[PDB]
Design a protein around this ligand. Sequence first.
Ligand SMILES: Nc1ncnc2c1ncn2[C@@H]1O[C@H](COP(=O)(O)OP(=O)(O)NP(=O)(O)O)[C@@H](O)[C@H]1O
Ligand SMILES: [Cl-]
Ligand code: NA
Length: 607
Amino acid sequence: IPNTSLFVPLTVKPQPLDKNEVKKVLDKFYKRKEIQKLGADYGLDARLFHQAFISFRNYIMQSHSLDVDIHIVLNDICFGAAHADDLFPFFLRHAKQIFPVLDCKDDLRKISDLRIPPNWYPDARAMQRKIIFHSGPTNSGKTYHAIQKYFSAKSGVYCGPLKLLAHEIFEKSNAAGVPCDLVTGEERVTVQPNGKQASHVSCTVEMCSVTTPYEVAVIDEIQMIRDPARGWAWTRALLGLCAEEVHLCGEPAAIDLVMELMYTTGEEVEVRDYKRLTPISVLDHALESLDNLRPGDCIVCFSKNDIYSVSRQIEIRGLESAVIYGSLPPGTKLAQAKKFNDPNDPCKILVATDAIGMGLNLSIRRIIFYSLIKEPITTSQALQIAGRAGRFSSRFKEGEVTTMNHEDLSLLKEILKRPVDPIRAAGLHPTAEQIEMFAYHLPDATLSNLIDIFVDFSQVDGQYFVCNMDDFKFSAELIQHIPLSLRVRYVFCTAPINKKQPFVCSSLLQFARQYSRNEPLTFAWLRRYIKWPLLPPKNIKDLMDLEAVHDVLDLYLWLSYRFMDMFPDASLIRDLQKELDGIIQDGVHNITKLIKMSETHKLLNLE
Ligand SMILES: Nc1ncnc2c1ncn2[C@@H]1O[C@H](COP(=O)(O)OP(=O)(O)NP(=O)(O)O)[C@@H](O)[C@H]1O
Ligand SMILES: [Cl-]
Ligand code: NA
């Protein structure tokens, strides 16, 4: 069972015998089928047996001094007083220092046993919870029902997939006369001047508390429970929120799994179905040509190159367009959204990625898929994107959907109507405590190696899977040379970073390094580090750089809530970040000039 390729051999350096005879004894020992078979009984397969033997022979041949007990046995084997198999217990103890996993396999199994996840949440197990799955398309009112139920409860928590949604529900709750706190990875707002927690809170799903009683919880986008990297946060909220009613919102493809899980907790599931609030239809004609653009059009693109090329093509036609993509800061996304939505603003076309699928209220008359390749978009993605046309909360009473090119149109019709398979399993991840206990057993393993050994030893029930830890392992490998305690290193490797931006990676090293030296990262120090003041961008690469500085400031903020004394200046950094969002916001308003500079001065080819 255990994958022995994951074991990185530790070095055991060398500390009267005939060394030529001993070698002969060693070489025969290695070759005895009996000895190899006894090796395998103890977990030494061919590779471990081999690697332990190489170092064992090495240690014996090169040590100036052996322990007395092994010395005597070698003397006695050489001189006929002992059988050669008597060397085996020494070889085994040697192997166990080369490969300490061989000394604690049962222990590691127990530590990484992830079966019966609900037992991890004794507070939720200790009370009745009823699960209500509000199932339906986007724009069906499934979310509105859950959220109103939340607004009317004496206490409640909303858990969303996106920071923008946590903000939005926090703003709506307070505007509706319901005191509501905000908890995201980067921000905590306590609205009550008494500093006490409000009885409603709006959070990103990873930040929800599983030890706080609530009358009502809402878990938005429940199907993200199968997300390969993030699904674990949805499993944790679904199994662990101590709410009398747990309201779920999402697609019907998540229902069967939810029922399998809630069967294991003995909790009732009530499904409530919703239909689209307004009409929607797919057209018989492609857009075919950008000449055919009309106010309220949204062209959805699957690469940033298409975003640039399309927004510039639109400009050269004498039209303005708004731009939305995932890595924009949130004040920019909102400012672009507001220009596009304002009927009296002549900017009336939106060029956006699939980031518009959730978290922004957009008044879109017609979705035009620019292409259908991201590999083709999935039925779920298409339906989420499509359904953004004609939202009940917009002035468009009906929605339209089409593609740009005519060949794509029946492919789109086909994708949209194709049945979606039930999702099959819920994500789990190793906790900080589990990895810290692994590290006590295997204190010389690197953290990225411990994660792989944990995953390999772990056991899960049929309805779960262990989430991907590639991001976490990339950070671990980046900071592996910095001295940090296990629990601190774990937190640093969980900070969410875009590993494709060198300045973000350089910043994580810098923050980890200063932490390790007890050197607080102050506002003044950070301001010089990012070379403030930063200037308006002149081209796309300048914009990308600003966005990368904005993410570094997010990294500082994320860390400040885990390490307050070493990142003590969060308010001041937030202020600086808001000035940087303003600069990026003006640059994005002017994005067609940045793009024109990139193409015409930098000669970048956008297609
Ligand atoms: N009864 C109602 N009165 C006023 N507005 C409503 C009502 N029902 C729904 N809405 C609005 O119509 C839009 C769609 O509702 P709903 O489908 O519950 O939300 P949604 O934003 O599409 N969910 P998502 O797919 O997660 O973005 C939202 O702006 C709602 O706040
Ligand atoms: Cl490490
Ligand atoms: Na524009």
